[PDB]
Each structure stands twice: as C-alpha cells, then as structure tokens.
Amino acid sequence: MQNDAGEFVDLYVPRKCSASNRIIGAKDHASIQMNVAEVDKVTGRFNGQFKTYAICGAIRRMGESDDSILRLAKADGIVSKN
Amino acid sequence: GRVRTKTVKKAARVIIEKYYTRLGNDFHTNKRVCEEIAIIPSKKLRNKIAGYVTHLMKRIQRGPVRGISIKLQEEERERRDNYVPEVSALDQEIIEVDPDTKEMLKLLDFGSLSNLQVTQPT
Amino acid sequence: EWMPVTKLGRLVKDMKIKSLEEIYLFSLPIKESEIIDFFLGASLKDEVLKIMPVQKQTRAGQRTRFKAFVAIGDYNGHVGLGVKCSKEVATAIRGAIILAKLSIVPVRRGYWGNKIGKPHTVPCKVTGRCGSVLVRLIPAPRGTGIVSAPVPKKLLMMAGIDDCYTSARGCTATLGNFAKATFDAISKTYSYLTPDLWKETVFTKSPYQEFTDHLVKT
Amino acid sequence: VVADAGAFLRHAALQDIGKNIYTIREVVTEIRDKATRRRLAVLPYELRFKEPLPEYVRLVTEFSKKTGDYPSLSATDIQVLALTYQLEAEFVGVSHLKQEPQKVKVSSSIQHPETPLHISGFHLGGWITPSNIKQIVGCLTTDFAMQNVLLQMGLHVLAVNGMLIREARSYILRCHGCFKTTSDMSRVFCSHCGNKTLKKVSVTVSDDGTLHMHFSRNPKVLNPRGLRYSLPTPKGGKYAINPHLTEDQRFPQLRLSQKARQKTNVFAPDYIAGVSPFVENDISSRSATLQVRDSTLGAGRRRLNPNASRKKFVKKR
Amino acid sequence: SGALDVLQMKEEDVLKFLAAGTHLGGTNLDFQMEQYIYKRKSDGIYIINLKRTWEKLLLAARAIVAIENPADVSVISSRNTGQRAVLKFAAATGATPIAGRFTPGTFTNQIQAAFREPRLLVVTDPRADHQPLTEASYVNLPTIALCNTDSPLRYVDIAIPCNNKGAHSVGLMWWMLAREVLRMRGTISREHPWEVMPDLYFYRDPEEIEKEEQAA
Amino acid sequence: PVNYYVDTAVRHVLLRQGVLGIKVKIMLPWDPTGKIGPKKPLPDHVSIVEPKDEILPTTPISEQK
RNA sequence: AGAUACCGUCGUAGUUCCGACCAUAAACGAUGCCGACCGGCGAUGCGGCGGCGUUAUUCCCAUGACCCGCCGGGCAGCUUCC
Ligand SMILES: [Zn+2]
C-alpha cells in the first residue's frame, strides 16, 4: 500500500462488500452498487442525497442479499423497526 | 405448396411500419404505392410483396399482428388500452376475510376497517 | 474510427472515463476491445503460447482447425489471456488477441521485505486453480527473478511481476489449464484482503450514475 | 322459448310445442359441430333471429355479479339471457320477478365432495335399464351458468326434457382462499386470487332461486398436509418443465406427435385393411424421446403429495 | 418504510390488498421468504405480513428514484398477467418496459438491436421471468422482484412479499409502486390520490372485451 | 447473378514436382462502374426508401402564394 | 455343416434337524471409527410434550383411533452456483 517514503504504491483501492466486508473483485459481475435514495423526514420528496450500498456476488447467489440490504437499511434507518 | 419467404415477409412489414397511412386493402393500390417507395428488382417479387402487404392489411383490420410496430396504431392502441370503467373492482362494500387474517390488522393497528366480513370458518 | 455500442465505450471515447481503473473499481464488464486499445495502446505486448491443431469428428472424417493461446500484458500493470479456436491459424491468433483484451484483470504488486521504492513481487502467497492444476505464487526477494515453468513466466513477466517463487501440481502439461491457473492466481492478488485494505471504502459516483447526461445525448 | 347452442349440441329438435322461439345469430355460427349445421339446414325456419337492447343487457349484468356468474358466462352467453329479458318484458308479467335474491344458507354436511351425488350408474336399485339415457315463454339451456341466472329471476324454463325445470343439481367451485364462487367446472385455478385453492362446492337451485349450498365440512378436504415442498430452480429453455404454478406462465410449446396423440376410433367398421388390431406406438419421433405425455395422463400422481415414499426407481415428467 | 407517517401504510390502501387478496399467500413458502410471513393458517395459505409487504415496496420506491435518467430502468413481465400494468407503468413513469417475451441475451449480447443497458431491473416474477434475472447477474444490475411466498430470492436485491398468482393482485402492486415513486419525484403530492385508476393496470383478459363491448 | 458478379480466373502454375492450378473468384460490389461493380443491384435485395419525415398540420391555414 | 452346449425325462450328494469343523463372497454405500462446524423443505419409525375438534355409542374422567404443532435419536427422500 505505502512504501518507505509513504507514497501510495497501488493502482486503485478495490471497494469492499457492504455486507460481508469482502473485496469486490474487478471482474465480478453479479456485484451490485445500489444507490438507495433518501427522503425528507417531512415532505417525502427527494433529498438530493442517496446511500450507496454494495453486495458481492456470492451473497447474491445465495438468495440472501435481500435480508442483507434489508438490515443494512435497518442500520441506516431507511427501514423502520418491525 | 405456396409458402412465402423472408424476402417477401421481412421486407413487406417495413412498408407497414413506415407508410401505413398510404396503404389500403387493394392488391392493386398497395402494388402501385409499392414501387413508389420500394426500390425493387423484378415485378414478380414486388407482386408477392404487395400481396403480403394486402393480406397483412386484412390481418391488421381485425387486430394488431405481432410483426408490426406502428407509430399510428400504437397511439390507437393506447387509446384503446385506456379502458377506464365506472367502478373499479377495488372500491367495494363487502370483502369476506378469514379470522386469521383478522387478527393481523388488530396487531398491525388497522382493526378499525369496517369493509371486512369475518365468515363462518369452514 | 471507432463507434462504440455500449454506454461504457462512449464515456471511454468521450473523455468521461478518466482511466482504466474506474472500470475496475465498480467491476464493470468490458465488451469492447477498443477500450483496451484506448488506455494501454502502445504499452501492450502479446505472445502466442501455443498453436495446436484440433479435429472435429465429422460424419465424413475430420477437418483441421487450430487453437491459439494468446496471453497479452501491460508490462507493470495488467495481464490477459484469450483462447480462440478457428480454422485459419491467423484468424485464431487475432481472435485470441481480442479475446485476451476482453480478459484484462489488474494485478496487485507487493514487497518481500521492507517497502523501499516500487513494488516488485506478489503481496502474499496467492493460489489459482484450473482443472487439476494447482499453481501457487510466493513472494520473493528483490532480484531473484521468476522461478517457474516457461509458461507462467510469460504472464508473470507481462504483469510486471519482477520476481516470484512458483510451485505447481497436477497435469501441468495440458497448457490451457496450466495457463489459466496462473492467470487465475494473478487475478486474485487484488481479490485478497490484507490489513492495508481496512480503510472503509468511500463509494464514488459510478460513471453510469455520473455521466448519464452525456448518455442521453448519444 | 330461447334456443341455445347446447340444445343443438344435444340436438333437442323441439320446435313443436314452444312456438315463440327467438335466438341469437352468433350462438349458432360459433358452433363447430357439423351435425348442428345439419340441424340448421332444415328445421329452424320456425324460429326468428333477434338481439337484445343495451339497456336490457346492462341490467342483466348487474345481478350477474350478484349471483356470481359474470366471469363464468361467455360473452355470447350474456346476450342470450338478455334476449330472454325482452321476451319476458313482452309476454309475461314483470310483477312476478325478483333480483338480489337470497343468502347462502350453508348446509354443512359430513359428505365428501367427491362422493357420487347422483351419478347414474353409481349406487349406494338404480340400474340403467337400456331406455334411460334419453331419460337422464322460456328457454332450453344445458349450461348451468345459463340456468343459474334464469331461476334467480324466477323464470321457469324447460329443456330437452319437455317438462319445466324445478330442480337444478350441479357443482360449482368456491375459492377456499378468497371466497369466490365460479360456475365453471373445468378450471382448477382461481379467477380472483389465482391459486389452486378452488374446492368443489355442490349446489341445489330451485325454480324460485333458493340457493342452499352444501359446503363439505370435512377435514380431509380442509387439510394443509401435502402442501409444502421445495421447488427446483426456475428453468428456461426449449424443454424446461416448470411445475405448473400459475394458470398462465409461458410454458414452452411441448406437443405430442399427431401419430401418437390420436387413439383408435374402433367403432368405425371401415377398419379391416392393413395394420395390427391396436394403434401403432410412437417409438420413432423426438416427441417420444423427450417423454412428452398427455396433460390428462398421470393426473393421479399429481394428487400424491411430494414428500412421500415413492419407490426408489421412479421419475415423473 | 422510513418510519414516517408520511410514508406509513395509509388506511385506504389496506383495503385494496384485502380486496384483491394479496394478503392471501401461496401454498408453498420459501424459507428465505419465511421472514416476511405473518402466520401459517389451516390449509396452507401463508398469510403475508402486509406491513412488512408495505415496508418492502418503499425501499423499492426509493431505489428507482436516484437514477437521473428514468429511461434507464427495465421493467419486465414474461407472462400475460402483468402485461398491461408494465406497459402503462412506464407511460406514467418514464421507464423502459419489456412486455411479453424477454429476448435471451437482451442484456449480454452487445451486437443486438434489442441490446439495452439499464441501471436497474424490476421483475414481475422470480419464477416466470427468471431469465432476465440471470441476465441481470452479468451486467451488475440491481433487482426488484414481486415475490410470492413461493419465490426464491436468487439474484434479487430488494424483494416485495405480495401475491402475484392473481390477476388483480399483480396490477395493484404496480399501480401503487408507481403511485409512490412519482410523488417521490415531484409531481402532485401526498394530498391528492392519483388520477390514474388501478383498473387500468389490471390484466385485460380479452374474453372480457367482448363482455364489455356488448354492454358498454 | 453469378454471371455478372463473380469473376472466375483459372491458371496453371508450374513447379518441379508437377502443376498447381489456382482459382480466383471476385464477387463484385454495387455502386455502378467507376471501375467498380455493375449497374444493376442484387435481385434478392429490396431497398426501401428511408422513412421520410413530414410535417403534421392541425389548423387549416391556406398558404396562398 | 459341426456340440460332448442353449432341451426334456429321471435323479446321487445336497437342500432339513441335531453335534463338531470349515472362515470365504460384487460380505457393496464398490465409500474406516469418534468428535466439531457447514443450506433448506416436508413426509415416515419410536419415545415424549402441548392442543381447539370427531369417533370407541357420545356423556363423567379415562384411555385408545384419527387431526395440528414441537423436541430428540433413526431408515429414507427431495431440493440447492455451500
Ligand atoms: Zn380464490
């Protein structure tokens, strides 16, 4: 990552999965980047803001990326409790 | 027998797509407008093309066939797609509901709905 | 003059995708070989690893066609591998050259001992598999060179890997298996979480979600 | 005396006593049987062609959903009942009609739905005694969806049986899920909720329209047992077979070969010359190699629950 | 749901799901769907927790919003129950629909004239149109599937527990999906109920055309 | 159209061991002869005039010159 | 064409019981034993736990017989890009 002098010796920083923290590989095509939008707490229109999520493919293979995104938006208050 | 060909079929459908408005139900007027637009070879080919155009006009005047994509018929279709009746079937008085469905909305704080009907459980 | 057929290629062509790296960051597939020619260009070399003749068992005998194992590589950055089977031997080669450009992984380079200067070896001891072919890359001190079979030495050279310790197992004589497996293993260097990579990833705007104003234009 | 396509399908040539015979032009052109067109060639000169009015049609459709038969009727089946409405407003006293008649009055029994309620050779005597096959103003309709709407108005009609109607014994299908009765006996999936939660419901309709319906209170039908099982991956291709969930998901075209799909018409005496005394079995085509079977064949294995003890060497479709 | 009373399931809308019978679930229930259920009852009709169903609509009613070009959404029915909804969905949306047959290779085969590159997929059925799901597994497409109780969540991204075996059951889901995303974007707001009646998005069933032309 | 599109040429080249004989066929294109191809197009090809865009009037305005 | 073989009629030893030998089998899941972890789904066998109901002539509790669910150990399935 960083050499002795401290320059960033790497090409790009690969993004990590937002569910299981694994590296999304560069040739991974079941991968997701779901830009979920934010609401007003009052009006219900579009904020201008949006929360980007990320699902790796092996999670998406298992049918479990539904609950994963579901509890990630629980974690960001986009899903109400119960 | 006498089976048409892709050169007959796939090229006639393009005349439908672009110039449906000038077409009609004649063989002999579809054929005279065919040479106005289709830069064709020999006349047997344009006769088979014009015959498939005429047969296809006959097929259209029942209803839309699969092969077409018409700028005029689809706006006609959307103005026949918009069948908006008086009473939609989601504005009704009595809808019979199982007792196990009833306990959900009492817990999901919508037990105040009066349009329901708990029936005799079978 | 190249006219792309994807939303990817237009943003590549029209100065909107800045580097090759942003395609790797959002893991977008590349379906147009000219994008590879756009960024790499001159800094890209290719090698025929084998031409083998194959025969289709036709009802009237056999007929001859040729496979072509072409590995390409940006020296210091990237590799690829393509396998085209055609009838004409010049056709099978130029098919696999395009087919290898469609298969460009990047590679991560690390250090053996202390991190002085530029990286030279594999960051950890990664492995790869392709059909009973185990291939293991191992980090190596600076200047030891590639200690391998002649075949993965091509891919490791064309990556920019200066030096490595290779160990392999299986029926390595079957070239396609043995060349994909070492292509597998160098593909996994960026697919390996090391403690450098614990910084939480700020998801930047994807160029689809960013430059879609220019995609409504064309 | 309104004539129907079922009266000519059973060939009820009864233009002799009822003499006010009116009919629809469409319901005789839609018949695909040639012996009915043979009936159309000679006899129907005594009847008259007529259509009902759009004021009359909509008022028929009002209590049609209130008797729960409007999707069960065909489109041509709507106009025939409205064709009776102008005749009744013309000839008969309108003052003896009713509409929105009556409730369900569930007569819950311990009788299984599949019991032979009045199937002729079945007996619990009742023989056949070979005369009785022909012993098995108004209308002549053999469709119960037609017959249901008539008697709820209080409209006595007749049939190929020259006497009037008083008893209407048939079966309908109520959705066990959404409580929706259809008069169709052919479909197996629901029309409102689309599940396989249709169950057999026997009715009994009088001439006045006393709807009383034997809902079979028996937990062999009210059963959740063979109802949960894991399903394979959804398969897409020319030869995929998805396990028939909805009434209309696009199955691929799988068809029998016409040299296999046809049986023997062994009744016909033009029969002697040539082949074996049975139909030749199809061992050649790729209809046989893909093991394409009839949708009606093997239906008893559908009724078997999935999680059971199948013998260790079977494989179905 | 984002715990807003602005976004809470309103009192009229509960009636429609009861009316068409979306609360009536299938006979089979996926264990991946067993989170979303309310209860098993007798005779295997797994009644779906509708507030949970309502919470999953709204995440999908946030997912479609962030895309700048609304044409970048593919909306697909493979069967003949969600044809009329999907077509006039995009008429009210600006989406890019696919009705009827999904051409295998619409998302992969870059040579085709049918080849489109969307940014988001919404599916009527994860069993009927499963073919554009596996297509969406290759082009990095997020996914929304109108999931029944028996609906495998494979390659879905968010999923909505409704019923879709019923004709009206499907059409109310698309109508009310479109009802929120438009009021999310900035048309007429939460006060007015929407001018398009959900009977427009019901399936036509052209045996009923001859049952509606002969009376109206 | 094999008789005005392809050009058949047949030779007899010599070597030490015998004779090779080559065959070269050149199927000519369209766009009539600026040394290039024939006048007459393919009798299978059906060129349809591109969809000519026309202005739609709404109000009866009589443009009298 | 060839048969001492594919056939039939009899039929010893054996197949049967008891007492000793004998220790091999395509003795098979062609898959050592014990323990842990790793997806689902119902059916079934045994034991137990709980429960609206129906029948043993109801009923009084019994107790069986079914029916819905749960636990544990079994023989088995089916499913699935673990
Ligand atoms: Zn139903």
Amino acid in position A75? A
**Distance (Å) of CA A23 to CA A54, C6, C9, D263:** 10, 26, 26, 63
Is residue E186 exposed (0-12), middle (13-18) or buried (19+ Cβ within 10 Å)? exposed
Tokens linked to C78: 């990237």
Helix (H, G, I), strand (E, B) or coil at D291: coil
Cβ atoms of C70 and C89 closer than 8 Å: no
CB D313 under 7 Å to nucleic chain G: no
The answer to whether B90 contacts E50, with C-beta atoms less than 8 Å apart, is no
Considering only residues 203-222 of protein chain D, which place a Cβ less than 7 A from any atom of strand G?
A: 219
- CB-CB contact of C65 with C56 (8 Å): yes
Identify which of D176, D173, D177, D196 has the alpha carbon closest to the alpha carbon of residue D186: D173
Interface of A with C in 31-50 (CB under 8 A): 31, 33, 35
D218, D110 Cβ separation under 8 angstroms: yes
What is the DSSP secondary structure assignment for residue C83, as one 8-state letter? E
Q: Measured between alpha carbons, how far is C104 from C98 in angstroms, rounded to an integer?
A: 10
Q: Where are the domains of chain C?
A: 1-106, 107-200
E79 CA distance to ligand 1 middle (Å): 20
CB atoms under 10 Å from CB of A12, counted, come to 16
Rounded, the Å distance between the CA of E122 and C1' of G80 is 24
Q: Sign of the CA dihedral D38, D41, D46, D50?
A: positive
Which region, left, alpha or beta, applies to residue D129 given φ > 0 means left and ψ of -120 to 50 means alpha?
A: left
Put simply, the answer to whether D194 touches E26 (Cβ < 8 Å) is no
Cβ–Cβ under 8 Å, residues C32 and C6: yes
Gap from D56 CA to G19 C1', Å:
104
B73-77: Cβ within 8 A, 24+ apart: B73/B20
Phi, psi torsion values for E202, nearest 5 degrees: -65, 160
Q: Which two tokens stand for residue D214?
A: 């034997």
E70 contacts: CB under 8 Å, gap ≥ 6: E64, E93, E94, E95
Closest CA relative to residue F46, chosen from B52, E111, E115, B1? B52
**Domain span including residue E132:** 13-216
Report resolution in angstroms.
Answer: 3.1
CA E21 to C1' G68, in angstroms, rounded, equals 25
Instruction: Tell me which residue of C5, C12, C4, C1 sits closest to C211, measured CA to CA.
Output: C12
Judge contact between E123 and E82, C-beta under 8 A: no
DSSP F16: S
Closest C-alpha to D49, from D74, D71, D28:
D28
**Residue in A46, A58, A49 with CA at minimum distance from that of residue A19:** A58
D139 marked as part of a ligand binding site: no
- Please give the Cα distance from C181 to C179 (Å, whole number): 5
- CA dist D305 and E43 (Å) reads 14
The enclosing H or E element of C166 equals: strand C164-170
Q: Are strands A35-39 and A46-52 parallel, antiparallel or unpaired?
A: antiparallel
Which residue type, as a one-letter code, is found at position D28?
A: V
Which residue, C162, C211, C190, is CA-closest to C21?
C190
Does an H or E element contain C165, and which?
strand C164-170
DSSP C19: S
Q: How far is E1 from chain C (nearest CA, A)?
A: 24
Q: Rounded distance, CA A2 to CA A5, Å? A: 8
Within 8 A by CB and 6+ apart from D285, the residues are: D257, D259, D260
Give C97-153 as a DSSP string. Answer: HHHHHTT-EE---B-SSS--SS--B-SS--EEESSSEEEEEE---TT--EES-HHHH
| Distance in angstroms (rounded) separating the CA atoms of residues C108 and C189 | 5
DSSP F44: S
Instruction: Name the residue of chain C whose CA is nearest to A7's CA.
Output: C117
- Give the residue among E18, E63, E56 at the shortest CA–CA distance from E36: E56
CA quadruple D265, D271, D274, D280: dihedral, nearest 10: 10
The two tokens of residue C127 are 């492995």
Cα dist from E17 to B84, B116, E47, E53, E203, whole Å: 20, 12, 12, 10, 16
CA D68 to chain centroid, in Å, comes to 15
Two structure tokens written together for D223:
């059963």
Q: Which amino acid, residue E126? A: P
Instruction: Give the pair of three-digit tokens for residue B8.
Output: 């007959």
Please name which of C109, C104, C108 lies closest in space to residue C39, comparing C-alpha atoms: C104
Specify the DSSP element, H or E, that contains B45.
helix B43-60
Neighbours of C89 (CB within 10 A): 15
What is the rounded distance in angstroms from the CA atom of residue C99 to the CA atom of residue D137?
A: 82
Which residues in chain A are contacts of C197 at CB distance < 8 A?
Answer: 1, 13-14, 16, 23
For chain A, the domains span 1-82
Place of tokens 């060939």: D11
Residue closest to B13 by CA, chosen among B53, B45, B58: B53
Q: Which residues pair with C165 in a beta bridge?
A: C138, C147
What's B48's domain CATH number?
Answer: 1.10.60.20
List the structure tokens of E127. Answer: 């069993």
CA of C67 vs chain A CAs: smallest distance (Å)? 24
Provide the CA E124 distance to its chain's centre, in angstroms: 5
Chains B and E touch (3+ CB pairs under 8 A): yes
Buried b (16+ CB within 10 A) or exposed e, A44-67: bbbeeebbbbbbbbebbeebbbbb
In a 3-state reduction of DSSP, which class is residue F62? coil
Q: Which residue has the tokens 């015998």?
A: F18
Domain that holds residue B36: 1-61
Residues in contact with D87: Cβ distance below 8 Å, sequence separation at least 6, in sequence order: D2, D20, D22, D137
CA-to-CA dists, residue D157 to A57, D160, D297, E204, F55, angstroms? 68, 11, 39, 34, 63
The C-alpha atoms of residue E145 and residue E46 are separated, in whole angstroms, by: 19
Radius of gyration, CA atoms only, chain D: 24
How far are the Cα atoms of C37, C44, C92, C106 from residue C41, in angstroms, in the given order? 5, 6, 21, 16
Give one DSSP letter per residue of chain E, joined into a string.
Answer: --S-SSSSPPTTHHHHHHHHTSSS--SS--STTTTSEEE--GGG--EE-HHHHHHHHHHHHHHTTT-SSGGGEEEEE-STTSHHHHHHHHHHH--EEEESPPPTTTTT-TT-SS----SEEEES-TTTS-HHHHHHTTTT--EEEEE-SS---TT-SEEEE---SSHHHHHHHHHHHHHHHHHHHTSS-TTSPPSS-GGGGS---TTTHHHHTTT-
User: E126, E153 in Cβ contact below 8 A?
Assistant: yes
| Residue whose C-alpha is closest to residue C101's, from C33, C173, C8, C154 | C33
Elucidation technique: cryo-EM
Q: Tokens at residue F18, please?
A: 């015998």
What's the CA gap between D42 and D32, in Å, rounded?
A: 18
Residue E83 lies in a domain: yes
- In single-letter form, the type of residue at position D194 comes to G
CB atoms within 10 A of CB D16: 8
Q: What's the CA gap between C71 and C78, in Å, rounded?
A: 11
List Cβ neighbours of C119 (8 Å cut-off, separation of 6 or more): A3, A9, C109, C110, C111
Q: Work out the widest C-alpha separation in chain D, in whole angstroms.
A: 70
Q: How far apart are CA F19 and CA A28, in angstroms?
A: 58
In this structure, are residues E104 and D236 in contact, taking their beta carbons and an 8 Å threshold? yes
The token pair at E58 is: 């709204």
**Beta-ladder partners of E120:** E73
Q: Which helix (H) or strand (E) holds D287?
A: helix D286-289
Beta strands in chain D (DSSP E): 2-3, 22-23, 48-49, 139-140, 168-175, 181-182, 198-205
Which amino acid makes up residue B45? L
Give the residue from chain D lying closest to B118, CA to CA.
D179
Residue-wise DSSP of C26-81 = TT-----THHHHHHTTTS-EEEEEEEEEEE--BTTB--EEEEEEEEEEETTTEEEE
Residue D168, beta-bridge partner list: D205
Nearest nucleotide (C1') to alpha carbon of D312: G77
d(CA E190, CA A43): 8
Measured CA to CA, the distance from residue D20 to residue B1 in angstroms comes to 51
Residue E42, number of CB atoms within 10 A of its CB: 14
Please state, in angstroms and rounded to a whole number, the distance separating the CA atoms of residues E27 and D196.
Answer: 8
Nearest by Cα to D41 from D13, D77, D79: D13
Interatomic distance D228 CA / G79 C1' (Å): 12
How far apart are alpha carbons C163 and C148 in whole angstroms?
Answer: 10
And the tokens for D50? 């007529």
Rounded-to-10 torsion of CA E9, E15, E18, E23: 0
Number of domains in chain E: 1
**Exposure letters C185-202 (e unless 16+ CB within 10 A, then b):** bbbbbbbbeeeebeeebe
**Plot region of C131 (φ>0 → left; ψ -120 to 50 → alpha; else → beta):** left
H, E, C per residue of D68-129: CCCCCCCHHHHHHHHHHHHHHHHHCCHHHCCCCCCCCCCCCECCCCCCCCCCCCCCCCCCCH
List beta partners, residue D42.
none
| Closest residue, chain A, to C197 (C-alpha) | A13
Phi and psi (nearest 5°) for C67?
-90, 155
Q: Strand G positions with any atom < 7 Å from protein CB? A: 39-44, 67-69, 76-82
